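INFO  loader      accepted 1 record
INFO  loader      residues=178
INFO  predictor   begin
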Amino acid sequence: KSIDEQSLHNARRLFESGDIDRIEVGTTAGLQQIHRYLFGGLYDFAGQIREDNISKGGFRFANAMYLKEALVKIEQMPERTFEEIIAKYVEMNIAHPFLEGNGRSTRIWLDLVLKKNLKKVVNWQNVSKTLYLQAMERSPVNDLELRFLLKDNLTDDVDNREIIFKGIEQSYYYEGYE
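INFO  predictor   done
INFO  writer      dumping tokens
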């Protein structure tokens, strides 16, 4: 819980400082920069591609033995349309490259890709925890729930402090932290 508190402060600092603007967009290295920023000094494995296997619910995330190879192909996916970007996010979630903190880091990664390509980001504060988690769990089979949920909650006000900071708080709530 104290880990989350410091991590939340790191997420706030990432945007306050403008360091968010220095992150490589839509790449594996980019995701690793985010993870390192959020969790450096908190998880030993911050920024590091996992070597163990993990699952959640009935889903086993990409096998560690071919995770690196998968990430190579995932980062090459196109980013021109909303549908392409969500598909790319869905595959990066399936990769789930870190032992922990995949959700918070990859959502920031998603916003960067959406901002670069569509000049929008997700207004996370209005995205229900229940609906978001259900949609993610379904996304490997069908991303319809996710597309429906996120498309309704896009905003072109991408630097607004309230959207940014209330979104960081909801993002952290998705994995347990109030």
